Amino acid sequence: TGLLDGKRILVSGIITDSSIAFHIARVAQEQGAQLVLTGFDRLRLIQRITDRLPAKAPLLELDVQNEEHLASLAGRVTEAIGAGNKLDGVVHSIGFMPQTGMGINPFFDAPYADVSKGIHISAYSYASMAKALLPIMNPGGSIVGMDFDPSRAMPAYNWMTVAKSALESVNRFVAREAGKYGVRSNLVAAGPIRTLAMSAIVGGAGEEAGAQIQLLEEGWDQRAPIGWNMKDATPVAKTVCALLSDWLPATTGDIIYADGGAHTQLL
Amino acid sequence: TGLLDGKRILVSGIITDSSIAFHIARVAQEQGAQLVLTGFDRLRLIQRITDRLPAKAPLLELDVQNEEHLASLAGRVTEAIGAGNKLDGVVHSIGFMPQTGMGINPFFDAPYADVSKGIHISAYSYASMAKALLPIMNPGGSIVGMDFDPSRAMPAYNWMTVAKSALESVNRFVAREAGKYGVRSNLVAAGPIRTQLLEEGWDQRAPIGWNMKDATPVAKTVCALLSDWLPATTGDIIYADGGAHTQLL
Amino acid sequence: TGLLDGKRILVSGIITDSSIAFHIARVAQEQGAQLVLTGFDRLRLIQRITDRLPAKAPLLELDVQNEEHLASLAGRVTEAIGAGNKLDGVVHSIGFMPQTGMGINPFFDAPYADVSKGIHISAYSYASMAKALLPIMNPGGSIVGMDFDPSRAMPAYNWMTVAKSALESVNRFVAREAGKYGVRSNLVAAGPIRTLAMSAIVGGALGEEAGAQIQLLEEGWDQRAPIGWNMKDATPVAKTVCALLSDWLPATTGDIIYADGGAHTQLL
Amino acid sequence: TGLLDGKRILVSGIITDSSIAFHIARVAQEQGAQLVLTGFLIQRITDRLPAKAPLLELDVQNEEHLASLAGRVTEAIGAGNKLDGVVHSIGFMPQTGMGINPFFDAPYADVSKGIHISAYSYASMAKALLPIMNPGGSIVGMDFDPSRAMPAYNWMTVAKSALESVNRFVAREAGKYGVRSNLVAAGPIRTLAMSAIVGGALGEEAGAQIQLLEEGWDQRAPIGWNMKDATPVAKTVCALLSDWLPATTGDIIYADGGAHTQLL
Numbered sequence A: 001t002g003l004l005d006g007k008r009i010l011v012s013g014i015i016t017d018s019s020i021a022f023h024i025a026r027v028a029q030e031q032g033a034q035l036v037l038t039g040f041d042r043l044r045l046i047q048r049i050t051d052r053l054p055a056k057a058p059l060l061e062l063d064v065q066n067e068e069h070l071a072s073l074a075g076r077v078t079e080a081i082g083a084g085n086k087l088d089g090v091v092h093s094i095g096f097m098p099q100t101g102m103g104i105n106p107f108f109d110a111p112y113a114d115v116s117k118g119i120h121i122s123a124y125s126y127a128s129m130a131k132a133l134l135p136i137m138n139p140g141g142s143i144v145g146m147d148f149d150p151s152r153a154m155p156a157y158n159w160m161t162v163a164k165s166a167l168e169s170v171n172r173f174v175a176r177e178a179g180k181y182g183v184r185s186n187l188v189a190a191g192p193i194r195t196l197a198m199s200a201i202v203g204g205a206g207e208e209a210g211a212q213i214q215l216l217e218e219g220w221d222q223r224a225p226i227g228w229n230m231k232d233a234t235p236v237a238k239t240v241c242a243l244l245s246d247w248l249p250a251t252t253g254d255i256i257y258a259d260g261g262a263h264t265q266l267l
Numbered sequence B: 001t002g003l004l005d006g007k008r009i010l011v012s013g014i015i016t017d018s019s020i021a022f023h024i025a026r027v028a029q030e031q032g033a034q035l036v037l038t039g040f041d042r043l044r045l046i047q048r049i050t051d052r053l054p055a056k057a058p059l060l061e062l063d064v065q066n067e068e069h070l071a072s073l074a075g076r077v078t079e080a081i082g083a084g085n086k087l088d089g090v091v092h093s094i095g096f097m098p099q100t101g102m103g104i105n106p107f108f109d110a111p112y113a114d115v116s117k118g119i120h121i122s123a124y125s126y127a128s129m130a131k132a133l134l135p136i137m138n139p140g141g142s143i144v145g146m147d148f149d150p151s152r153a154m155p156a157y158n159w160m161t162v163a164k165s166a167l168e169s170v171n172r173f174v175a176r177e178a179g180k181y182g183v184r185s186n187l188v189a190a191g192p193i194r195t196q197l198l199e200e201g202w203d204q205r206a207p208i209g210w211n212m213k214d215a216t217p218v219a220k221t222v223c224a225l226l227s228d229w230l231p232a233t234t235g236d237i238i239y240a241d242g243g244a245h246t247q248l249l
Numbered sequence C: 001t002g003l004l005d006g007k008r009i010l011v012s013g014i015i016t017d018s019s020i021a022f023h024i025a026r027v028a029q030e031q032g033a034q035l036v037l038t039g040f041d042r043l044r045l046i047q048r049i050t051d052r053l054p055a056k057a058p059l060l061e062l063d064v065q066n067e068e069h070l071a072s073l074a075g076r077v078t079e080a081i082g083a084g085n086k087l088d089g090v091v092h093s094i095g096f097m098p099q100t101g102m103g104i105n106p107f108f109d110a111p112y113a114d115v116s117k118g119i120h121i122s123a124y125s126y127a128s129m130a131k132a133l134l135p136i137m138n139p140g141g142s143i144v145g146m147d148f149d150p151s152r153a154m155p156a157y158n159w160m161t162v163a164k165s166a167l168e169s170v171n172r173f174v175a176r177e178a179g180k181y182g183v184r185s186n187l188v189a190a191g192p193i194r195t196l197a198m199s200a201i202v203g204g205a206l207g208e209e210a211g212a213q214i215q216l217l218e219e220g221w222d223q224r225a226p227i228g229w230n231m232k233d234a235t236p237v238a239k240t241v242c243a244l245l246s247d248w249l250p251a252t253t254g255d256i257i258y259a260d261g262g263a264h265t266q267l268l
Numbered sequence D: 001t002g003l004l005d006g007k008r009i010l011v012s013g014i015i016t017d018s019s020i021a022f023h024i025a026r027v028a029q030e031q032g033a034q035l036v037l038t039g040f041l042i043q044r045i046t047d048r049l050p051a052k053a054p055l056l057e058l059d060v061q062n063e064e065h066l067a068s069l070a071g072r073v074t075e076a077i078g079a080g081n082k083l084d085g086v087v088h089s090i091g092f093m094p095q096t097g098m099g100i101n102p103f104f105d106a107p108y109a110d111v112s113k114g115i116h117i118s119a120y121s122y123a124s125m126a127k128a129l130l131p132i133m134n135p136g137g138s139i140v141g142m143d144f145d146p147s148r149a150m151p152a153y154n155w156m157t158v159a160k161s162a163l164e165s166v167n168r169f170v171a172r173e174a175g176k177y178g179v180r181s182n183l184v185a186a187g188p189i190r191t192l193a194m195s196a197i198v199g200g201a202l203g204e205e206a207g208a209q210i211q212l213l214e215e216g217w218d219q220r221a222p223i224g225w226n227m228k229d230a231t232p233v234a235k236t237v238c239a240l241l242s243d244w245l246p247a248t249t250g251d252i253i254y255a256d257g258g259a260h261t262q263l264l
């Protein structure tokens, strides 16, 4: 008697057990969903992480920059879930921006090749995934992507913030296409979560950037009327599952904020 | 086994069986919630409507313009749900603007007495209800109000649109207060519901379409916010409008 | 040649020489505008303040809560500027919220009578002024009101923030009406300025706690603003209002221009 | 006694006399500004402007053009002189990403070229020119409101969403020099590509789509909207280049007849 009982859902973006996608996958399985997972590059290592999930799930290779991976995705998912079965949900939890465009490097010093790679992986791929998977989605279906509120500029995030602005626009266009299939498309704008890259910047991977991210995180918990725990991805995973469910059936091309309400408060 | 199993929820705003609050109340009961209902003025007529709901629920009088009704509300709800029990949810589905400020009357011809009454009932009362009920709410609780996107001006809705702009601001302040109790506060901005060119353009803009004769998708959205499935969302607006507000043409 | 050469502009909201309206009036006169000023209640005291402006201007009584003052306004302005002459600009620089709705008093403790008075003066009156003055405005005309960004909640401002949310909505409806006359309607959302009430809260009038939270708000504003923010200087705000009163933003209406050092565009 | 008397302003984006940049350049010269123009033929068009102005080559995708830009501008305005204004009126999206081609059928090479020219180049131009800008300076870019999706504009709308974000970051950098950075979000203007789509170049369906958008725009705008007249847009850019909006940065000013503030 789970929120997602009998739903077939594809979850991309698991790299470590701290990944937001790991928590999305875990909560979805606790709620009765049958998953199909996608991983990038380090598949053997990712399989060791996904073995820690409460239930078994097939793991498929997917590099969103690889046109052949995208062209074969629907076929490979259909083989994993059985012929005549379609997906009810798709989770895009993919993002990347090279250090030249996200970190200590000045905003003006990011070369376009790095910015373009970042936008391809972080924004364009939301449309690529929808193009590949909409033909194998059921009506009442739901596509969810991960966002970080880019309405205002902030230190260090730089070109990743620009990529999120592009993602929000892409989501609105994806909703127009998804609507033809009776499928919704939405983003979850999360507050800061201590994943691999976030733990590295706070850890000093130098001093100036580390301090900026610390100040940003402290301010977030301060502004949030219900507080914000950057070490806990569960409220974010629950929000994604709410959008994957049948309980937000008239919401599409939109953004749901799972940020403790921090974006609604100035001070 | 439902979405709101064992939750105690107060639902205001039922006047007819077409009221958005009637559909919110119906879906919440289908999902296992134990309700307390509030009504305005025509209580005998409202009790006949609430008798049509799938389960029994106590009906309490509440005129949001009446300070005595507000002062006694928590006490009356506690008596209805039993001593030692608190609310998990509150639904504000109240709105009114006299014809002088909402309809065919020119925007400039609405007298302030009418605008003030409309704002009192439609916006200020969201704070009044939260003030009265937060002392009797459990942590993890949820306050939901009804909204109509007022970010852009439109024909006829005139001063009611102004009242919705005020409501959205009130909601952000209510969230600051509610947070102290571990309670969330959010609005559901719905598309038009039958409770003409403006309403036709909605279904055309909406990527998943819009059915103005069906309040169920709106009621389901309210129930999602009343549940434990949006635990990090507060002082916010969820749009149950078929996605029309995200599309220009 | 001034930015507003030969323009006839009504400016409301002067109470002290620190009032944003005083600085709007001063810059407009420096730029060649012919003004008509409106004041509330203490008119003799306001006349002593307006005598400090670079040029003479008739001062008319206007209580926005007084229906008779609104009904006679157009007639009184016409008498001041001469028959056959119309206004090119209108500046609404009026705001009020009692201490029960704006200050140290809890958000839930503001009674509706106080909130209603505050909304009447701060939001509804923008429509009242437009209704009274649009029949005596020239095409190409401009109505400007003062705003404080209410998109997010903040400490102390409380019901004044709610009144500003209502004002922004009113402005969008006023633009629909003004458009029929070839007149624009816009708001200038300013950063914090040390006017009468602002000087009082910073000074400790509302206590230690309120003084500290307004100080923190002001420091954060100058920090966030990429070009900084000087709360002691109303001139950048006055210049922005004059830009909207000019012919240089001719396709902007029902809108908000931010004169806040760019603070609202930055998170940290 | 013009709005921009004695100001030295760089204007990019002139291709035809219908280009928004042509009208920005014309109004700025009428208002006393001394211009430096950049083009990507164009000299024959710029000869139609009221005053003479040096024309410099600038392909924003060309790293050598960007690296030498400040030096070439300094040579044109004289040593010891700096710019007071910069106008970015550059945009491009191949037909695969903007037009009749389905949103999902745009290849990344085309989208990436479009984003490079339309969004990233706003940061490139600021990087190259901020070292040669005076305090009180102003950088202005052209935008088309991308807050909501719309037919045909597709990936160009995505590029504009990216541009709005870029502008907010450019403002942080510009602030260090006492320089403002803002965008003007204009309503539809009948420039080269816009005249082609309305004319039927992309077919019957696309032509009808853009005609409906234009009609709706004029209808919603409380003061109306004339798509054949770029002058209100050029005036707005000049207002931002002036000293009259000195506390506005990382922002968007809408020169759209107020259409974006009205639903119907």
Ligand SMILES: NC(=O)c1ccc[n+]([C@@H]2O[C@H](COP(=O)([O-])OP(=O)(O)OC[C@H]3O[C@@H](n4cnc5c(N)ncnc54)[C@H](O)[C@@H]3O)[C@@H](O)[C@H]2O)c1
Binding pocket: A012, A013, A014, A015, A016, A018, A019, A020, A021, A039, A040, A062, A063, A064, A065, A092, A093, A094, A095, A096, A121, A146, A147, A148, A189, A190, A191, A192, A193, A194, A195, A196, A197, A198
């Ligand atoms: N961590 C936060 O603070 C935070 C906040 C808000 C939103 N988000 C977003 O949440 C999403 C997940 O990030 P995370 O924080 O869980 O971090 P993460 O590092 O654990 O996850 C990012 C994932 O993207 C994958 N990826 C990168 N390049 C790829 C490619 N070419 N093909 C396919 N997948 C590729 C990586 O393998 C990884 O699994 C991202 O979109 C991120 O922007 C994160």
Ligand SMILES: NC(=O)c1ccc[n+]([C@@H]2O[C@H](COP(=O)([O-])OP(=O)(O)OC[C@H]3O[C@@H](n4cnc5c(N)ncnc54)[C@H](O)[C@@H]3O)[C@@H](O)[C@H]2O)c1
Binding pocket: B012, B013, B014, B015, B016, B018, B019, B020, B021, B039, B040, B062, B063, B064, B065, B093, B094, B095, B096, B121, B146, B147, B148, B189, B190, B191, B192, B193, B194, B195
């Ligand atoms: N109908 C739509 O198209 C639409 C769209 C979006 C949002 N909404 C909002 O949803 C809410 C419910 O409206 P509805 O469409 O269900 O219509 P409705 O007429 O059925 O409900 C409005 C309710 O407000 C109550 N009310 C009025 N004055 C009151 C007072 N003094 N004290 C207490 N309650 C009072 C009425 O008794 C009634 O039950 C309102 O806030 C409305 O603005 C409606």
Ligand SMILES: NC(=O)c1ccc[n+]([C@@H]2O[C@H](COP(=O)([O-])OP(=O)(O)OC[C@H]3O[C@@H](n4cnc5c(N)ncnc54)[C@H](O)[C@@H]3O)[C@@H](O)[C@H]2O)c1
Binding pocket: C012, C013, C014, C015, C016, C018, C019, C020, C021, C039, C040, C062, C063, C064, C065, C092, C093, C094, C095, C096, C121, C146, C147, C148, C189, C190, C191, C192, C193, C194, C195, C196, C197, C198
């Ligand atoms: N000071 C700031 O930090 C700040 C920031 C942003 C916007 N604003 C806005 O700027 C405007 C001017 O405020 P200010 O800061 O110059 O303060 P102020 O105290 O100098 O001016 C407010 C004016 O409102 C007038 N007023 C009040 N009740 C009135 C009534 N019934 N009829 C007519 N006039 C009436 C007062 O007489 C006074 O002249 C207001 O709308 C305010 O909300 C101020």
Ligand SMILES: NC(=O)c1ccc[n+]([C@@H]2O[C@H](COP(=O)([O-])OP(=O)(O)OC[C@H]3O[C@@H](n4cnc5c(N)ncnc54)[C@H](O)[C@@H]3O)[C@@H](O)[C@H]2O)c1
Binding pocket: D012, D013, D014, D015, D016, D018, D019, D020, D021, D039, D040, D058, D059, D060, D061, D088, D089, D090, D091, D092, D117, D142, D143, D144, D185, D186, D187, D188, D189, D190, D191, D192, D193, D194
């Ligand atoms: N309806 C509209 O026309 C409209 C609406 C809003 C905003 N805008 C924006 O206004 C700006 C000007 O466009 P326009 O409508 O005048 O069209 P246009 O065709 O007249 O101008 C576009 C310019 O971009 C230049 N450009 C393209 N690739 C370049 C490169 N690699 N390096 C340098 N320059 C390059 C072209 O040479 C041309 O000068 C654009 O940013 C556009 O997106 C246009």
Ligand SMILES: CNC(=O)c1cnc(NC2CCN(c3ccccn3)CC2)c(NCc2ccc(F)c(Oc3ccccc3)c2)c1
Binding pocket: C094, C095, C096, C097, C098, C099, C102, C103, C104, C148, C156, C157, C160, C195, C196, C197, C198, C200, C201, C202, C205, C206, C214
């Ligand atoms: C003798 N007269 C007064 O004591 C008086 C005048 N105008 C007032 N409210 C106006 C001021 C101008 N304005 C502003 C001012 C600042 C931001 C936005 N709007 C509109 C509201 C006013 N309000 C009550 C009050 C009484 C005493 C105060 F110290 C404040 O300051 C304050 C509170 C909260 C946030 C910022 C500042 C406010 C009192």
Ligand SMILES: CNC(=O)c1cnc(NC2CCN(c3ccccn3)CC2)c(NCc2ccc(F)c(Oc3ccccc3)c2)c1
Binding pocket: D090, D091, D092, D093, D094, D095, D098, D099, D100, D144, D152, D153, D156, D191, D192, D193, D194, D196, D197, D198, D201, D202, D210
């Ligand atoms: C010989 N050169 C070309 O054929 C050419 C020039 N610039 C172009 N794109 C520019 C146009 C101006 N601009 C705009 C225009 C309108 C809104 C936003 N940006 C930036 C992008 C361009 N794009 C492909 C295209 C090719 C043919 C067209 F009719 C269009 O028009 C169109 C498409 C979709 C929406 C509105 C209009 C576009 C082609």
